[PDB]
Structure formats: C-alpha cells, structure tokens
Amino acid sequence: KMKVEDYFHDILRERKIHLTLIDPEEQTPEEAVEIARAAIRGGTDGIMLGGSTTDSSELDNTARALRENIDVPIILFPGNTTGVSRYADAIFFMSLLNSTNPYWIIGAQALGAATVKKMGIEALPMGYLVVEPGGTVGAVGDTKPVPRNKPDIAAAYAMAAEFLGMRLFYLEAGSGAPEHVPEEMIALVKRCTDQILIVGGGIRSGEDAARVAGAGADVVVTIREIVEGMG
Amino acid sequence: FKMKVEDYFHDILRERKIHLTLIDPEEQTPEEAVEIARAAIRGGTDGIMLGGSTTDSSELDNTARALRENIDVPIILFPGNTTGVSRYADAIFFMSLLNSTNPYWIIGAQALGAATVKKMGIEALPMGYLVVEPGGTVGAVGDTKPVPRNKPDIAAAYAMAAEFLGMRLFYLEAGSGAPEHVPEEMIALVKRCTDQILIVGGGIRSGEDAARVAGAGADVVVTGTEDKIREIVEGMG
Amino acid sequence: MKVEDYFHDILRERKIHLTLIDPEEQTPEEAVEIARAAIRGGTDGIMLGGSTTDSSELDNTARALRENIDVPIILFPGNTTGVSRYADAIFFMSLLNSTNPYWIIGAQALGAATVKKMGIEALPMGYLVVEPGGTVGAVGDTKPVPRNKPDIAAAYAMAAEFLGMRLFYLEAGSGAPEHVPEEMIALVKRCTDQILIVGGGIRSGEDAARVAGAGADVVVT
Amino acid sequence: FKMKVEDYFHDILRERKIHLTLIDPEEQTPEEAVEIARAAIRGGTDGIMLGGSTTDSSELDNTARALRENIDVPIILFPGNTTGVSRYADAIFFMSLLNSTNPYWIIGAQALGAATVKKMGIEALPMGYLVVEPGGTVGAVGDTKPVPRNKPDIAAAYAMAAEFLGMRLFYLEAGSGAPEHVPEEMIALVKRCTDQILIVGGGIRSGEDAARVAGAGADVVVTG
Amino acid sequence: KMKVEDYFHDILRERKIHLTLIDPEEQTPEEAVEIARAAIRGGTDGIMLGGSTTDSSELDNTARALRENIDVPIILFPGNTTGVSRYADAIFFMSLLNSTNPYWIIGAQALGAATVKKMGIEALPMGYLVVEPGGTVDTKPVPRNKPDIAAAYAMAAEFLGMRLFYLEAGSGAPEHVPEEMIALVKRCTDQILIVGGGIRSGEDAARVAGAGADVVVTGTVEDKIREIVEGMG
Amino acid sequence: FKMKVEDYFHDILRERKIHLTLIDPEEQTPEEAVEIARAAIRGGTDGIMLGSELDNTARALRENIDVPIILFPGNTTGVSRYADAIFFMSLLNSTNPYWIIGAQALGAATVKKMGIEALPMGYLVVEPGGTVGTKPVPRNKPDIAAAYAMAAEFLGMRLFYLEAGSGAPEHVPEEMIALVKRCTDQILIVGGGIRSGEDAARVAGAGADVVVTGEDKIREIVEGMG
C-alpha cells in the first residue's frame, strides 16, 4: 500500500503513465476484476474507480473485488461523496474549477471531509477542468466547458490551481468524446505549470494516446495499442 | 524579506506565534504609511499586509515601493481584487473565499490574476479563506454565506477540504469591525482538524482580545489601528 | 403495508411520531437499542441519515434495524449518500428555499436511478427550512423562511402541492432554540392537503403539543 | 365544456395518442384565436394550449374568454410565467423548468402564482419541463442549461427525479420553431424509465415530423 | 395628461412628494378609487399601483377605474413583468440592485421591456435597493448600519443612468430606512430619492423626509395620509 | 484632450460615424501607444480606449493627441485619473451579478473621486464572445439582443455595446445590429471581429454608430465606413 504520488514520481523519470477507468455500475464486481487484469495485460499501471455518482455499496463491493486481486493502485474518482471507500489506495481530492456552482468547487468537498479523514485514503490535490465538448460531466455539474480554441484559459486555471496547492491537474474532455482535448492546450497547460498533467476522454486511437502523451500529458486515462502509443 | 515567507513563518512558530499588520493602502498616503509601518515594526510586528482595497492600485504599487525601500520585514499582498497585485510585495496570500456564493471568489478571480502573479517573482502562499458572522463588510461585498458562530463544524469541514486541496494556510475572518472577534471554540477546532497555519483576523482590539484568540490556538493574528501594537503582541505572550 | 398507506391509516391517533437516528453519531447496535427504546412507547417509525459524509455507517445501521424492529425505516437524505438496501421508504425531497438548484433538482436528478434500482417506496416531499435553519441552513444554501412570514411558507407549500409533492416538511433545524411557530404550521395546513411534517427544536411534550395542536400530521425528534 | 382533463387524456391514451396546439394570445385578436382553434378541432386536435410566452395577461384572459365559450375541448394554459393565469382555462400545466440554472424557474415562480392558481378553480397538472438542444428562445430566456441532443441519459434522470417528486407529466421541449425535434432516442428512453405521460413539442412541422415523435413513445405531441 | 417626471420636478421645487401605494390584489377596482380618492383629499400626489405578482386582468380594471376618476398620476411599481397596463401614466422601471440573482437585476426587464415600448408608457429609470429587514422581498438586504454599502449601489446606479433610487425597507417593516442611510445617499448622488416601507406615522414621514427623501411611499393604511403629508410638510 | 466625449460623439454623428482605436496598455509600454495612437489618428480615428501600465499609458496620450481617451474597463483596475471619460458599463447577459452591478458598485467611488465623465453603457456579449464569451446571445436570436438593448435603455443606459469578442471569426450579424439600432435611440457601439474595410462597412451599414477595432490600417477601416 505504498504511496501513489511517489509511485508517479517514480514512473515519470523514464516513461509515461496510463490508468484504466472503470465504473462500479457498468458490470458486476467480479467482471470488473477481469477487466482489471486485462488492463495490466496491456500494461496499465493503475485503475480508476468512480465512474459517476452511484450507490456506495457496489462501489465498495467493486473496490473489495479490486483490492485483493490487484496491486497496481486503485484510485477513487468521485462523481460525488458517494465515491469514497475504505478499499481504494488513494482518492483524487479535486475541484472542478470551470464549474458555475460552488458545491462542485468546494461544497461537495467540505461535506465529504470527515469521511476522507476518518478513513485512511491518500487525498491527492487536483484541479479538474472540463474541456469542450465535456460529455456527461459537461451538464451534470453545470460546467462551462473551456473551448478548444482557447488554450490559454486552461493555463490560467492551471496556474490558479497550482498557486492554491493543487499539485495535480486534469483536462477532461469527457468520457466518450469525438476527439481528445486539443493538443496545444495540453502543451500549454504543461508550459505554465509543474503539476502532474492528467488528460482524459475522447481517447481511443493508439495515436490518439500517442498525441495526447506526446503533447506533454503526463498521464493518459481511458489497451496494448495505446500503452504502446504512449512510448 | 529576501526569502520565502512561508519558511519565515515556521522559523517563528518554533518559539512563539506571529503578528501581521493590515495597512489598507487607500486610507493614507505612501510615506504616511511607512511611518505607520515602522511604528508597527517597533511595537512588534512581523509583517505588513497590503489589502482592504477594491479600488486604486497605482496608489498601492507606490505603497509597496515605500516599504521595500524602508523595511527589512515581509510585506504581503492581501488581494481584495485583481487590482491588488504589485511587484514590491515579498509575497501574496493566494487565497480562495471558500464560503462565497459566487465562484469568482473561489476560483474565477484567482484564474484571472494567476497569469499576472506568475510573471512576477511573488511568492504564492496557498490559503483557504473563510468568513464568519457577521462578516464585516466582507459579509456583503464578496457575496457570501458567512459561517455561523455557533456552527464550528462548518468551519472545520471547509478548513479540512481546503487542506486536502493543498491550501496549507487557513484564515478565519470575523470581519472589518465586528463587535466580538472569531469564536474561540471555533479557532481551536479547525486548528485540530487540519495541519495548516491557522490565521485569525477581525474584531481584535483590546490586549485581551489577541490573548484569547492567540490563546485558543491561532498561529497568527492581524490588527489595524499609536504604538498600540505591543498592547496587541503582549497577548500572544 | 405501504408506508404512506400506513401514515394515512392513522385516521384516529393522527399523530405519526418519528424518531430521527444518526448512523455516525453512534454504532449500528445500540441504535437498535435506542430504536427499541424509542419504539418502547411513543413512536411510529424510524428516520435515518441526517448527518452527511460516510455511507459505510449507513448500510450497517439500516441492515441491523430492519430485522429487529416492527415499524418502518424511513431514509432522510442529507445528501445522495443516505440511500440503503434495507429501508422501507424514502422522503424524496426538494430543498425548496435553496438558492442553489443542486438542492432542488440537482441531487434528486443525480440519485433518481438508485431509488429506481431499489424498489424503495419514494415519498414525494417538499423540504422547507424555517429560521434559524441550522446546519441544514448553511449546508444547503438555504434562504431560511423568517418566522414572521407565514405567507411565504404557505406559498411554497401550495406550490409543492401543485407539482405533486404530497408531503410537506417545515424544518426548523437540529438545534433550533424554538420550534416552528404554530401560525406557520396551521397556515400551511389550511392551504394544502399535504401530510404536514414539522421538526427541529421539539424536546418536550408541550413542545410536541404546540406543533401537533396547530395542524402538524407528523412530529419528528 | 368542462371536466378534469387528466381523466380526459387518459381516456384517449388507451385507444390512440393525442395532439395539442400551442396558441400565443399575443399574436392574434382574441377573436382570431377561436377560428384558429375551431379549425384545428375540425383537424385532429384533442385540445388547445394557450401561452408559450410571458406577457401582460389582459389578453390571455381575453382569449380564454372566447375559447371557453365556443369550443368543447380543454383549454390548458402553458405558462410562460406567473403572468399567464386566467380563470377561464380548463386546466394548467404547473411546470418546473428542471434544467434551469436559476431557482426562480424551478420553484421560485411557482411559489408566486400557486396562490393565484388555488384562488381560481383551475385543474393543475403537475409537470416536469425539460429544455433539450437547441432550445429555441426558451433555452436562454430562463437561462436553462439545455440537455444535449446526444445525452438522453441526462433527460431520463431528470424525468425519473421529476417522477419521484410526484410530477406526473414530463415535457420534452425542443423550442418553438427549432430545426430538429427532440431526438427519438431521448423520447423512448424517457418513456421506459418512468410512468409519466410524455409530452413532446418544438420544431416539428411535417406530418412525418409528428410520425417519428409519436412513434418513439410520446403520449401527446404539441405543434405550433 | 402630462409627464410624471416633469410633474415630479414641478413639486420638488417647494416641497417633497408623497405617493400612495395601493395594490389591486386586495380590493375591487371600485374600492381602490375610494381609497385613492381619499388619499387625494388627504394630500397624496400620486397613486402607485403594484406590489405583488398575480393575475394582471385585475391590474387593468384597477388602473382604468382609477384613470377616469382621479386626476393624479397612476404609477406602476412592478413585482415582475406582469405589472404593466395601458392605463398607467408611467412605470418605475426598476432594477433590484442587491438581488443575488440576475433575473431581478436585468433579466426580468429584458423579458418585460418590449411591452413598455409597445405602449407609450413613460419609463422612469430606478435603482431599487432592499435594506434589512426588507419585508418579504433573492435579496441580500443591506444591513441598516452599512450605508457605505448602500451608497455605492446608488452611485453605481447613477453612473449607469438610473435617475431614481428607492431605499426599500419593504412594506410592513417595523422600522423605516435609517436617516444616516438616507442622508448619505442624497449627498452622494443627484437621483430623485424615494423612501418607502415602514412609514406609518406622520412622525415616521417627517424623519424620513428631513433626512433627504424626495419621495415618501406609504401603503393603503383615512386621515392617516393627511397626517403623513403634514408630517413631511 | 478636452470637452465632454458624449457631446463630441453626438457631433460626429450629425456627419458620419465614429471609429475608436482600442489599445490594451498591458500589451505594450506607453511609448508605443502614442505611435499606435498617431498611427490611429493618421487613419481617420476619433478616439482611443484602454482596457499601472494602464495608468501610465493614458498619462502620455492626453499631452500628445486631440481626441478623447476613453476607459474600457473589465474589472476594477481599469480606472485612471488620466482619461477624458469612461465606459461605465454593465455586462448585461452575465450569469454572476458581479459583472452586472457588483463590480460597478465596488468601483463607483473611484469614478466619482476621479472627476472622469462617465458614460452609461449596456454591454452585451455575442456568440462566440472571445475570452469573455457570461451567456453569449446566439448569433441567430437577435430578439434577445434587442430585449437586452431596450431594457438597458429604460434603465438610462444611453450607450450600448454588442461585443463579438476580440479575435472572433466573424463580427456581429448585420441582422442584430440593425434590429438593436431600430429598437432603441441609444449610441450603438459594435466591436470584435472587425479587421477589414469590409468588416467595418457591414457593421457600419447595418446601423452601428461606433466601430471599435484593436500600420495606419485604420484608414482602410475608416474608408470602409464611408
């Protein structure tokens, strides 16, 4: 159960890192754990559970089925406060900044700060930024998705987030998007900032993930085709 | 002064607490204000804070040059708005108003000034910022839900989330002119739930005010209005 | 029986009392013993939830109480967290004087399919915070109805009634020094047909008399 | 003619699917509204809808006027605001604008007119009202956050949520005179997730426009 | 049969202006006449019609009975966009400045404005600012001891060309808007300054008027008006 | 520098339309802005708008040029004691009240203290909007734009600004500009997306009173409004 940040600050000296996103609602716990091991077949180095906002008995029951089989870390990815569980190794403690509603920026984050202090999860500080088009996290959290031809707005939100201590950033275009976050935006946020750069959504081609990672994305989030593309 | 202020803080919390003096630049002229500032560095202040302003800043930029010519102690920006960025600031409280009703005071204004402050070598101290009843003018300017005094758990929730987002500093503001300062049973709770340097300001006038507010667990204390400062450093004794 | 069909059934006693239990304020067990203490005279049903945050605590407490008691377990969500396999029924409620649409339709939009996934009896409820409010005051971006404006509370109540919200809930806050005024309870009751629920600041028998005597169909403590 | 028009819709939804027509009292003399409506009873219209606009109500009362005293189909007023509440309508869609960013259109404005709606003997049909892309002008007037066209999952969730608050009808609004009507995938998904009476309107102009909508699940089609 | 703003300025040259706020919700249109007729005998300069949000066919029948009996400006004081009528002589076209929600600042006026133009109705541009308690009226009411706050909105309002200003304690409030607040705003701006809600005495009316109010607005509460007008004069 | 700008404006409009060169003073030190200015003024320009390197720029101009210096602020920084006048504007279709009335109220006391002429101006963003693009009016809903424009007139905003946003692909639709100009009697400013003489002329022929653009490439643009 060694620390996930030092784990990333140990991969990045040499290669780029990929993590597999799975939703506790889109299959049984077990069928997810065979999706889990089919991802280190390709060679992914972590699993991202959380998907959306869902009942938190399955979420634990799929983090339990994930805990035992696996030892690449499994990181929570809270669609809401129902996205916390004993079994995961690390939570992404994130604020979606380009939201229009304080609850998504700080509210949900304050209501759920006894649970992450009662339990023993690694809270990683993260700015979360929805790029156009946005996907379901687009309208779910009332976000204004940063346009594709406006990279320097994303950078402004990076620096803002870096100054407030969020050592990690996320450029989500949305799970299941036509194309990834545009490539200049990636390089540019990376230019102005020294956080771990996490790009996700709309990411399918082996070259989709070559270009996202090539554009400076420190982490690709979505196999063998793609982990070979990010190398 | 010529070094990271955050590192300067800890070299003080080794043996005591910390006191900082708010000088709103607009309520005086620059070389009038150094005369206040050094008056402060004699009663026992450990920094000058440059804020309380949503107004002019050419004015405020001159203010900063005055103190850097004339002091050896940190002067720190307190940004009431993107106006509030100079270059002779040794540092800035890059803060977020957690209990604001409008995101501009949680992230928006920070996103806008983010470009400006990276340009300068202005040390960026990450600080969650939270206002309590009744809030002074803050409890109405930056549209806010000021946290009730008898609901401390709400200040801890905010402080703890703030601590998980990476904001290593945290500031209770009862408000410019409140009759009583921040409740002591609330200062002591957020000091326990997080590991942040806890700041507390507003309402402290008497010597015994800064006493019970530096005594209830606050690491640093903030004052405004002779050499009355040692009568406010006496109390963090 | 059906839990709402049970409430209406009290066409005589006309005093549904419900006990509000917090999972995290204790353990899953003496909650049962306090539940049993509570069913031991003078209660008709068990509300659960209140405190937000953790869901682990919820499920054990719901699981432990379904077996040991004979009265309904009603979930009271402080957020989309308070949902469980082992409850009889849910107050499916909009926080009506919220300034923030998340608390009026957001969360409910976000949690509809988990109340779909169980079969849980979903009771449509209007949730109105009265001054002072409380924790749920600041937590839900309320605009707490002043005690001096019975008109305002009544207007929301007719509205929820007109949108199909069959149950109303004037909430004065856990910790309220004064329960809701009996003029606001009796106006809301004269204006709508909703099962009127009052809570917060009720700690005595004459406390629960004022609330009850004015109109309140259901009393919560 | 008068009786509860919820029982009337249900009376028709066993044998067939019903149609309604949106009249704007502000585009026409109250007198014109009768021939414009009676001609639709000669057509396939099962009842008449009045509104789709916020304006002063001296005219909606003055068009409820003549429809009430001439035709034998229900007059359901379709409220552009608290303005639109006349005593001669046979019922009203008491709507929430579920995907509004502003509490005023979810609950605020309902709280202001609910006393005027109870004051009058008007049947009130509880209804969710969801704006889906492009939205037309209504999808900026309230400042809705229109549900995207390719995300019927969001629509269904609002529809379910809506159902669990006791809102028995659901309205999928494309927006008057929009280009393409509310997408078919978003219609069927709503109708299977809830027991609501589905109402669909906006940007349908053909008989084939109404064919595809009616054929994916919509109980009632609204046409301009 | 003349311009209400000009009418406002004709009076303001040797006295202050009193207007009566009647309210078509709670009287037949004929009863409002007898009230309005009685405020006129008592010395009121204008009727203000509005103060709610409902059926507007009533707003019309009240404005028309009023228009063919009284000889005085009928003024609309709107609580939403339903508060318009062809029988008024003018409308307070107001922004609720310290609303928390844009609809009341500008959206409602965007929605309603095409109808103020469809009709010749004179529009007086008016900042509307709610001061605590604030009656029933998405407002963060200004505190009664934060007048520097109140005067900034007033100054704002002016620079945006809002010629009029309404310190609202909200009809029914226990105490009227403080004089330290009134007298701050009249020295800071050139607006016609209207103060309403909470004034029930000739005593109340005096202290408000002497603080600087140009207009005193009091509701339907019948010698009372004669008292209130006297209190001011 | 001298005279009231609004009455300067009203006088050009008895003859022609008004073009204003917009200079962001954070984008160059003051020394070039006067060259950029005299350039603008070599082209048919009628005035300069900026929006402390801000306060330092306007300082110059006044002493070198004979057309007003107008302030075009976005935040609370955009006020300096050195301009002939200021666009005191309310971001109409903002979604946060700060850009409608708040930030005005916070900054109203600098504007009075500095005796600058203050122009009441509705300011309304258009699809796509640029970086300020807030809930921009769709490019095909000019009804919305008109409603806003008329509203701001009944509140006493005698000036009105449709902003496509700087660097926009195209300017504000002719169908919108014409409709706003026909609903209100206010000074109509249009800006963003005007790069060419033809840009300048479509916007100008559709009914705009002012045209905001930001070497002497102004001469094309001014030529255009002929």
The amino acid present at F162, given as its one-letter code, is L
Identify which of D137, D141, D143 has the shortest CB distance to residue F95.
D143
Q: Write the residue in E140, E142, E146 that is nearest to B143 by C-beta.
A: E140
F131 near A CB under 8 A: yes
Sign of CA dihedral F193, F199, F200, F206: negative
CA distance readout (Å), B106 to B156, B162, B200: 17, 11, 19
F114: left (phi over 0), alpha (psi -120 to 50) or beta: beta
User: In Å, how far is D103's CA from the nearest CA of chain E?
Assistant: 9
Contact B108, B99 (CB under 8 A): no
Q: In whole angstroms, give the CA distance from residue D54 to residue F147.
A: 13
For E146, the closest of B101, B137, B143 (CB atoms) is B137
Nearest to C53 among A86, A103, A114 (CB): A114
User: Which tokens is A68 given?
Assistant: 């035992």
Among all residues of chain A, which has the CA nearest to that of C51? A111
Under 8 Å CB-to-CB from C171, ≥6 apart: which residues? C127, C128, C129, C130, C133, C136, C199, C200
Record: contact C54-A115, CB cut-off 8 A: yes
The fold of the A1-231 domain, in CATH, is TIM Barrel (3.20.20)
Can you read off the two tokens belonging to residue F134?
């807030």
Say if CB F73 and CB F49 are below 8 A apart.
no
**Chain F CA closest to residue E125:** F155
Question: Is E46 annotated as ligand-binding?
Answer: no
Q: Is A45 annotated as a binding residue?
A: no
DSSP string, C123-147: EEEEEEEBTT--HHHHHTTB-PBPT
Task: Name every chain D residue with its beta carbon within 8 A of the beta carbon of A138.
Answer: 148, 151
What is the C-alpha separation between D142 and B92, in angstroms, rounded? 40
Tokens 């734009």 correspond to: F145
Contact between D164 and C99 using a beta-carbon 8 Å cutoff: no
* F87 within 8 A of F121, measured Cβ to Cβ: yes
Q: Where along chain A do its domains lie?
A: 1-231
What is the SS3 assignment for A56? coil
d(CA D119, CA E25): 11
Calpha distance D76→D64 (Å, rounded): 10
Of A102, A109, A117, the CB nearest to B165: A109
Q: Is F79 on the interface with B (CB under 8 A)?
A: yes
- Is F164 annotated in a binding site? The answer is yes
Alpha-carbon separation of residue E126 from E164, E165, E195, F156, F205 (angstroms): 4, 5, 12, 9, 34
Q: Quick one: which of F210, D78, A117, D110 has its CA closest to C162?
A: D110
DSSP 3-state percent helix, strand, coil across chain B (nearest 5): 40, 20, 45
Q: Which CATH number fits domain F1-226: 3.40.50.1100, 3.90.1150.10, 3.30.450.20, 3.20.20.390?
A: 3.20.20.390
Q: For residue C88, how far is the Cα from the chain centroid?
A: 14
Are the Cβ atoms of F105 and E152 closer than 8 angstroms?
A: yes
CA distance D154 to D145: 11
Residue in the block written with tokens 């003073």: F25
The CA distance from D103 to the nearest CA of chain F, in Å, is 13
Would you say domain B1-237 falls under CATH 3.20.20.390?
Answer: yes
> With helix as H, strand as E and coil as C, how does B59-78 read?
HHHHHHHHHHHHCCCCEEEC
Which structure tokens are listed for D21? 């027509």
Interface of D with F in 134-163 (CB under 8 A): 137, 140-141, 143
Contacts of B112 in chain F (CB under 8 A): 75
Neighbouring CB atoms inside 10 A of C80's CB total 26
- ∠ CA F123-F127-F132, nearest 5°, is 55
Q: Which of C111, C88, C105 is nearest to C6 (CA)?
A: C88
- Residue E130: which region, alpha, beta or left (left: phi > 0; alpha: psi -120 to 50)? beta
Q: For chain D, give percent helix, strand, coil, nearest 5.
A: 40, 20, 40
Q: Residues 6 or more apart from F41 whose CB is under 8 A from it?
A: F65, F67
- Residue C84 φ then ψ, to 5°: -145, 150
Q: Give the number of other CB atoms < 10 A from CB of residue A35.
A: 15
Task: Check CB contact of B167 with chain A, cutoff 8 Å.
Answer: yes
* CA–CA separation, A24 and C163 (whole Å): 34
Residue E70 token pair? 């009284």
Name the phi and psi angles at B172, rounded to 5: -90, 125
What distance in Å separates the CA atoms of residue A58 and residue A60, rounded to the nearest whole number? 5
Residues of each annotated binding site of B for sn-glycerol 1-phosphate: 171-177, 202-203, 224-225
Tell me how far CA of residue A11 lies from CA of A15, A121, A219, E44, in angstroms: 6, 21, 10, 82
What count of other Cβ atoms lies within 10 Å of the Cβ of residue B192? 11
What would the two tokens of residue E4 be?
A: 């209400």
Rounded Cα distance, D133 and C43, in Å: 50
Asked if C63 has any chain A CB less than 8 Å from its own CB, the reply is no
The tokens for D118 are 């109870």
Sort out which chain D residues have CB atoms less than 8 A from A136's CB and list them.
Answer: 151, 153-154
E99 is in an annotated binding site: no
CA-nearest residue of chain D to A101? Answer: D101
> Any idea which fold D1-224 has?
TIM Barrel (3.20.20)
Is F88 close to E123, i.e. CB distance below 8 A?
Answer: no
**Residue in chain C lying closest to D96 (CA):** C163
What CATH number should be reported for the domain whose range is C1-221? 3.20.20.390
Q: Which CATH class is domain E1-233?
A: alpha beta
State the Rg of chain A over Cα.
Answer: 16
Rounded-to-5 percentages of helix, strand, coil across chain E = 40, 20, 40
